[PDB]
Amino acid sequence: LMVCNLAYSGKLEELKESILADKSLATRTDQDSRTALHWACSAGHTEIVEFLLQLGVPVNDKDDAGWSPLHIAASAGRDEIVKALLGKGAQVNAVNQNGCTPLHYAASKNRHEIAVMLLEGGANPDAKDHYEATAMHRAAAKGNLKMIHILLYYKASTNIQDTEGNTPLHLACDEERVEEAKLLVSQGASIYIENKEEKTPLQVAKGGLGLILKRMVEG
Amino acid sequence: EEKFIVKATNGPRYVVGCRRQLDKSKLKPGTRVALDMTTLTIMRYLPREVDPLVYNMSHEDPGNVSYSEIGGLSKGCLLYGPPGTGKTLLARAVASQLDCNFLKVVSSSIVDKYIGESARLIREMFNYARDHQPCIIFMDEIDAIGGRRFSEGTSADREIQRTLMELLNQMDGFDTLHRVKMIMATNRPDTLDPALLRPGRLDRKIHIDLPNEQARLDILKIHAGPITKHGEIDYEAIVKLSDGFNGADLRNVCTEAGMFAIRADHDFVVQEDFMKAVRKVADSKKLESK
Amino acid sequence: VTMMQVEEKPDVTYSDVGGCKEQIEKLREVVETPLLHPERFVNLGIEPPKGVLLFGPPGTGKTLCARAVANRTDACFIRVIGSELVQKYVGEGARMVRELFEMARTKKACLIFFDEIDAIGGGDNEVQRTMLELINQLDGFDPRGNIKVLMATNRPDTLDPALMRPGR
Amino acid sequence: FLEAVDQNTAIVGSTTGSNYYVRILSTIDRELLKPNASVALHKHSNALVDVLPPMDIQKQEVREAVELPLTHFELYKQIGIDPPRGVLMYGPPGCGKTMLAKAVAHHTTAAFIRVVGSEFVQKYLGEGPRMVRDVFRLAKENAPAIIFIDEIDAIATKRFDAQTGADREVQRILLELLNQMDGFDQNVNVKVIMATNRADTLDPALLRPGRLDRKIEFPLPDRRQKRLIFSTITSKMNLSEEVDLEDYVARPDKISGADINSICQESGMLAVRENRYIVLAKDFEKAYKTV
Amino acid sequence: RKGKCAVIKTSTRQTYFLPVIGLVDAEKLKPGDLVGVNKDSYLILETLPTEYDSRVKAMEVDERPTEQYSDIGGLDKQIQELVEAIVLPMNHKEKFENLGIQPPKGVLMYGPPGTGKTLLARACAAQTKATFLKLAGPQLVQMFIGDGAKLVRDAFALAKEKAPSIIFIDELDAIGTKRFKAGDREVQRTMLELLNQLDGFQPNTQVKVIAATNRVDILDPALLRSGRLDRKIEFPMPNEEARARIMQIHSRKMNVSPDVNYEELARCTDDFNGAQCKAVCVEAGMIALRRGATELTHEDYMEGILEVQ
């Protein structure tokens, strides 16, 4: 629609005169079940979402797949948009297409402020998706150490079994992250859990890193 | 340079010489030539062509008066379907005049019975349009491939709408069409893909009808050429009583009145059977105009 | 297979009527009477009847076929099964039916039985040639349109002979 | 020409496939008696006058073992000669054989012989040796090019019967060049890289040391290659801040596949609807479930 | 020194070279087969069109039928336009130049099934005196690809090449579906190809193409044109009067009893069709033989109606 270009490019007076001339444009959606809030949150505009959320647009408007705008603000890295959506009362544990939560995508961008705002509002630290994977599996899958640490500021679990039976320690050792494996083990990781292919975190680690893994377990 | 190697169609290869008449212009490799059974001399060459390229470059339609027989009618053109016909007589009238080619694009050539990879044909034929500097494209009966995809379309609709996505990507995408021209002809101006109805492609809209009394009178006079009538001539009743009809079907109704007059095997045809038979038969067309 | 399919052997007589009181007359008046009384059906009417149609459950099938073969008071006639047309090198069906109908013209209007239409009815276009041409040779009165029509099938799943059969 | 049975007399195969037995002319010397040659008889006399002339581990390993000897001459003489000239790659699930070949074609500016293993599978058994000798001579003469032989499993399998005598003949050609590469160990101006997806049916002569001294493997999870293949396509495409790469680097860890860049191009062909201005997860997971 | 040549292909898969030669050519120069050629010089002497594939060429080889237009009763007000539309375009070609008249090539003979429209259009084809050539709807749907193009170009190959004939098709509605893969979209390729041969061909003033549809539920909107199916004469279900007329003229040969008031059969025949009453007449001619009485009785009408229906 036209409001997709208006909220996309950031036309201030064109969108203001467009909504003040026709209030239906705010509630109108395109063929992909995406309203102006999804385009202005995907674009990161503050004033436009302050006007749309000021008029009182439903914050829980999901698309065809189920992507809530809180995933867009969490993955977007825009702290102010998270302040606005959480200020309006967004669902901190909204279910998207693949059953994930905004914690996984805010963790993907390594945005600490968004994680503090979401987890402070009551987000589940151990929120599992369809594949039984939490934010620690993905943050460890890229190397977000401080994101896992601020996840541990909220007493998150470090032994979530993945869809293949892999704990976050398995993915930390698979990513060849030494400090992350030593920190997860030092903070309560389990080295005895086995996956579907029957491989312990010691065997998954190469270069004799399992000896210092178990050494730090006993030490 | 004088004697080279030839490759026969049957499979065995040979070597021939040069004839004293021809020169080294056409003797360059990569050009199909002809040979003789005796001495293997060369009379002339053989220009390649598609077995089908002759069909695609030969269909031609004569007639130069059709450009002036369209009646009182003074990067894309939409020929929609209000109560008036002639979308084919005009495109075939200028197409019969010059057209600079005969690049006709039928709406039944995007069937793609197999996997829907018609993008090779959109980029292939439109790549031919971008290759040849002059090109005119006709798109007749686009309503069949003009599905509005309102509800969830099946695999048969999704591939046609995907070809429409290639049309979007090549009309308002990253490719201009300043020199090529397309003529989108259809039947119903209601299901014409309002996403494609953007004025960026279809600059003007020509409602093919008979609104003007001079256009209906002109088309009536060009269709009333070879007919003989009585001395009592009155065209203002036929033109006046006819309101929003089809041109070629007005020819079919007038000739239908000429056959209604030939039922009584009279050589002369009075205009009474024209008023009453064009009246009644045209009212039957209004009954069957739903 | 054509000359292999020739059959002249005595078999089950009329004594094996299977309890069908009315049906045995519905087929007996077309298998026995038209041959015995050629003039009675031409003068009394316009032509003798065409034939009957035995199908449905197999049960004791092919017994009434032999009953029809031995029922002729002159000479046992030829019967044709339908399972011989589905073979390699398709197209032989045309010449087969044209030469057995030509021999039907040679046998002074003899009667021909066609068994197992389900083996040639119901890709299958190479079979559509033989069965649609077969319909063109049955509805086509060139060999004869009066001698005998009878088909035996296990299932009614043959729609083309079911829609073309009301003609003759 | 097929074979020479004795002096001044040989056999010659006609174009139609029938072999002809014709005594050669005395004026022609023994130079034209090459078994794989383009002989031409007469149309009637059938006599010949003259013949016609026809990561970081494989990037560092292939880097220093391949391109460092390539960009310098006589190093084979002045490095304490060792033959790790043949490099072999493995791994069916990874696509490969296009990005490493592009990287080789961009890091170095020379000629390259891209010949997929089925390039000589034709009806003429003698075209193989002509092609490989022409490529060998133009390689050793023009510039130190690189021959990219892929999928050697289909042309490197043992055979005992004579029904497939064409494959045994071309594997005897593989033995011929397999001995010529032994003779070309001294100052040859060509490199022979190699890649295969099957190692069970490979011939033991190729895997013999001294010939293929580089046997690298490919991992099933291409995590860094998923990151680089998504970044190399999103760097030019419109960047959406909602697009994540952690579930799209963790899901292909389980369901591994090829041509991920082409999957992103299909995601763009589904995102060219013009209703969605920037691509998102809809056409990512939809592009996954379609292809 | 003018340029003129042609490409030759022998049956033995041998390609040669030769220019366009022979006698005065009018219908020649087309890519066809069955041309004249001597032993080895390979010249063109006698070109004649071959038309493969006899399975489509010899579809329905009918010279002329037996029934005529005088076999029905009560339809002259709607069949007279078709009788004119087949007689006057065959004999009055001279007057077509004084009046400038071109007969339509597409006539839509639509109505409910069982109305005998096939045998009635054939009954008028006996009056056309031209060669009658049937064609069935389900014959275009074949296993191989591109067959419908060969069948359509074959129909216009015998109509275009051969003498003035008559080609009547039926069951066109069974394949005239306007779907929005799909087989009826392949029938939109072949069908829209035929419509392109009835829209883009101005020399189509030759042999007409008569069509009949057993239902007008899926009506293709693109079937409206002078050359296309413009003649839309509605043929409804005949009433008991018209059914007694067509049954009387179709039963005028059998020994029918003179004490027939047509009231009992007129009452029993409710919402019936033409070919259904034809089946009642034939059935009466079937059991009337075995009834003993050579004269047709009155109970045989309802006996046949309740027998077959």
Swiss-Prot record, chain B:
Its main location: cytoplasm. The keyword Cytoplasm applies. This is 26S proteasome regulatory subunit 10B. It comes from the Eukaryota. GO terms for cellular component: cytosol; cytosolic proteasome complex; extracellular exosome; inclusion body; membrane; nucleoplasm; nucleus; proteasome accessory complex. One of its GO terms (biological process) is positive regulation of proteasomal protein catabolic process. Belongs to the AAA ATPase family. Component of the 26S proteasome, a multiprotein complex involved in the ATP-dependent degradation of ubiquitinated proteins. This complex plays a key role in the maintenance of protein homeostasis by removing misfolded or damaged proteins, which could impair cellular functions, and by removing proteins whose functions are no longer required. Therefore, the proteasome participates in numerous cellular processes, including cell cycle progression, apoptosis, or DNA damage repair. The modification N6-acetyllysine is found at K7, K113. Keywords: Acetylation, ATP-binding, Cytoplasm, Nucleotide-binding, Nucleus, Phosphoprotein, Proteasome. The modification Phosphoserine is found at S151. ATP binds at G81, P82, P83, G84, T85, G86, K87, T88. One of its GO terms (molecular function) is ATP binding. It is found in: Cytoplasm; Nucleus.
UniProtKB/Swiss-Prot annotation, chain C:
Keywords: Acetylation, ATP-binding, Cytoplasm, Nucleotide-binding, Phosphoprotein, Proteasome, Ubl conjugation. Monoubiquitinated by RNF181. ATP binds at G56, P57, P58, G59, T60, G61, K62, T63. GO terms for molecular function: ATP binding; ATP hydrolysis activity; proteasome-activating activity. Component of the 26S proteasome, a multiprotein complex involved in the ATP-dependent degradation of ubiquitinated proteins. This complex plays a key role in the maintenance of protein homeostasis by removing misfolded or damaged proteins, which could impair cellular functions, and by removing proteins whose functions are no longer required. Therefore, the proteasome participates in numerous cellular processes, including cell cycle progression, apoptosis, or DNA damage repair. Belongs to the AAA ATPase family. This is 26S proteasome regulatory subunit 7. The gene is PSMC2. The chain holds residues 161 to 336 of 433 of the full protein.
Swiss-Prot record, chain D:
The keyword DNA damage does not apply. Component of the 26S proteasome, a multiprotein complex involved in the ATP-dependent degradation of ubiquitinated proteins. This complex plays a key role in the maintenance of protein homeostasis by removing misfolded or damaged proteins, which could impair cellular functions, and by removing proteins whose functions are no longer required. Therefore, the proteasome participates in numerous cellular processes, including cell cycle progression, apoptosis, or DNA damage repair. Belongs to the AAA ATPase family. Keywords: Acetylation, ATP-binding, Cytoplasm, Nucleotide-binding, Nucleus, Phosphoprotein, Proteasome. It is found in: Cytoplasm; Nucleus. The modification N6-acetyllysine is found at K282, K286. This is 26S proteasome regulatory subunit 6B. It comes from Homo sapiens. Component of the 19S proteasome regulatory particle complex. The 26S proteasome consists of a 20S core particle (CP) and two 19S regulatory subunits (RP). The regulatory particle is made of a lid composed of 9 subunits, a base containing 6 ATPases including PSMC4 and few additional components. Interacts with NR1I3. Interacts with PAAF1. Interacts with TRIM5. Interacts with ZFAND1. GO terms for cellular component: ciliary basal body; cytosol; membrane; nucleoplasm; nucleus; proteasome accessory complex; proteasome complex; proteasome regulatory particle, base subcomplex. It comes from the Eukaryota.
UniProtKB/Swiss-Prot annotation, chain E:
Its main location: cytoplasm. Sumoylated by UBE2I in response to MEKK1-mediated stimuli. GO terms for molecular function: ATP binding; ATP hydrolysis activity; identical protein binding; proteasome-activating activity. GO terms for biological process: blastocyst development; modulation by host of viral transcription; positive regulation of proteasomal protein catabolic process; positive regulation of transcription by RNA polymerase II; proteasome-mediated ubiquitin-dependent protein catabolic process. One of its GO terms (cellular component) is secretory granule lumen. It is found in: Cytoplasm; Nucleus. ATP binds at G111, P112, P113, G114, T115, G116, K117, T118. The keyword Transmembrane helix does not apply. The modification Phosphoserine is found at S257. Keywords: Acetylation, ATP-binding, Cataract, Cytoplasm, Deafness, Host-virus interaction, Intellectual disability, Neuropathy, Nucleotide-binding, Nucleus, Phosphoprotein, Proteasome, Ubl conjugation. Belongs to the AAA ATPase family. It is linked to Deafness, cataract, impaired intellectual development, and polyneuropathy: An autosomal recessive disease characterized by early onset of deafness, cataract, severe developmental delay, and severely impaired intellectual development. Patients later develop polyneuropathy of the lower extremities, associated with depigmentation of the hair in that area. This is 26S proteasome regulatory subunit 6A. It comes from Homo sapiens (Human). The lineage of its organism: Eukaryota, Metazoa, Chordata, Craniata, Vertebrata. The gene is PSMC3.
